[PDB]
Amino acid sequence: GGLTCASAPQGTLRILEGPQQSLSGSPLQPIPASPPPQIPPGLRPRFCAFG
Amino acid sequence: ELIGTMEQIFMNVAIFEDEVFAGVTTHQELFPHSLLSVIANFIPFSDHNQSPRNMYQCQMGKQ
């Protein structure tokens, strides 16, 4: 138990978690565009001129 | 996702479905008129008005 000074280390291992990327890199999934306003069907001339 | 104010300036959100490009836009807004207030969303057809006339309506809508 003299606890002498040992030599300098050769290198460094570093352990850390890696993320999973099987999900991302996929084609994007955007929010679907709301439709442009379309005229309602069944619009008729309700007003007829008097006389 | 909830993004913040400093976080927004490094993101490329898109406004419409057409503006989404792969590898460019990371995010997209919920609906294109989400840049406006509660009160400023009560102005009809506000993208056809001049902008001081929309600023005046937000004031005189409250009077």
Curated annotation (Swiss-Prot), chain A:
Transmembrane segments: none annotated. It comes from the Eukaryota. Residues 18-41 are annotated as: Disordered. It is found in: Nucleus, Nucleolus; Chromosome. The modification Phosphoserine is found at residues 26, 34. Residues 29-41 have a biased composition (Pro residues). Belongs to the eukaryotic RPA34 RNA polymerase subunit family. It is in an antisense orientation to and overlaps the gene of the DNA repair enzyme ERCC1. This gene overlap is conserved in mouse, suggesting an important biological function. Component of RNA polymerase I (Pol I), a DNA-dependent RNA polymerase which synthesizes ribosomal RNA precursors using the four ribonucleoside triphosphates as substrates. Involved in UBTF-activated transcription, presumably at a step following PIC formation. Component of the RNA polymerase I (Pol I) complex consisting of 13 subunits: a ten-subunit catalytic core composed of POLR1A/RPA1, POLR1B/RPA2, POLR1C/RPAC1, POLR1D/RPAC2, POLR1H/RPA12, POLR2E/RPABC1, POLR2F/RPABC2, POLR2H/RPABC3, POLR2K/RPABC4 and POLR2L/RPABC5; a mobile stalk subunit POLR1F/RPA43 protruding from the core and additional subunits homologous to general transcription factors POLR1E/RPA49 and POLR1G/RPA34. Forms a heterodimer with POLR1E/RPA49. Part of Pol I pre-initiation complex (PIC), in which Pol I core assembles with RRN3 and promoter-bound UTBF and SL1/TIF-IB complex. This is DNA-directed RNA polymerase I subunit RPA34. It comes from Homo sapiens (Human). The gene is POLR1G.
UniProtKB/Swiss-Prot annotation, chain B:
The lineage of its organism: Eukaryota, Metazoa, Chordata, Craniata, Vertebrata. Disulfide bonds: none annotated. The record marks 56 as: Active site gating. This is DNA-directed RNA polymerase I subunit RPA2. Transmembrane segments: none annotated. It is linked to Treacher Collins syndrome 4: A form of Treacher Collins syndrome, a disorder of craniofacial development. Treacher Collins syndrome is characterized by a combination of bilateral downward slanting of the palpebral fissures, colobomas of the lower eyelids with a paucity of eyelashes medial to the defect, hypoplasia of the facial bones, cleft palate, malformation of the external ears, atresia of the external auditory canals, and bilateral conductive hearing loss. TCS4 inheritance pattern is autosomal dominant. Catalytic core component of RNA polymerase I (Pol I), a DNA-dependent RNA polymerase which synthesizes ribosomal RNA precursors using the four ribonucleoside triphosphates as substrates. Transcribes 47S pre-rRNAs from multicopy rRNA gene clusters, giving rise to 5.8S, 18S and 28S ribosomal RNAs. Pol I-mediated transcription cycle proceeds through transcription initiation, transcription elongation and transcription termination stages. Component of the RNA polymerase I (Pol I) complex consisting of 13 subunits: a ten-subunit catalytic core composed of POLR1A/RPA1, POLR1B/RPA2, POLR1C/RPAC1, POLR1D/RPAC2, POLR1H/RPA12, POLR2E/RPABC1, POLR2F/RPABC2, POLR2H/RPABC3, POLR2K/RPABC4 and POLR2L/RPABC5; a mobile stalk subunit POLR1F/RPA43 protruding from the core and additional subunits homologous to general transcription factors POLR1E/RPA49 and POLR1G/RPA34. Part of Pol I pre-initiation complex (PIC), in which Pol I core assembles with RRN3 and promoter-bound UTBF and SL1/TIF-IB complex. It comes from the Eukaryota. The active site comprises the fork loops, the loops and the rudder that stabilize the transcription bubble and assist polymerase translocation. Belongs to the RNA polymerase beta chain family. It is found in: Nucleus, Nucleolus; Chromosome.
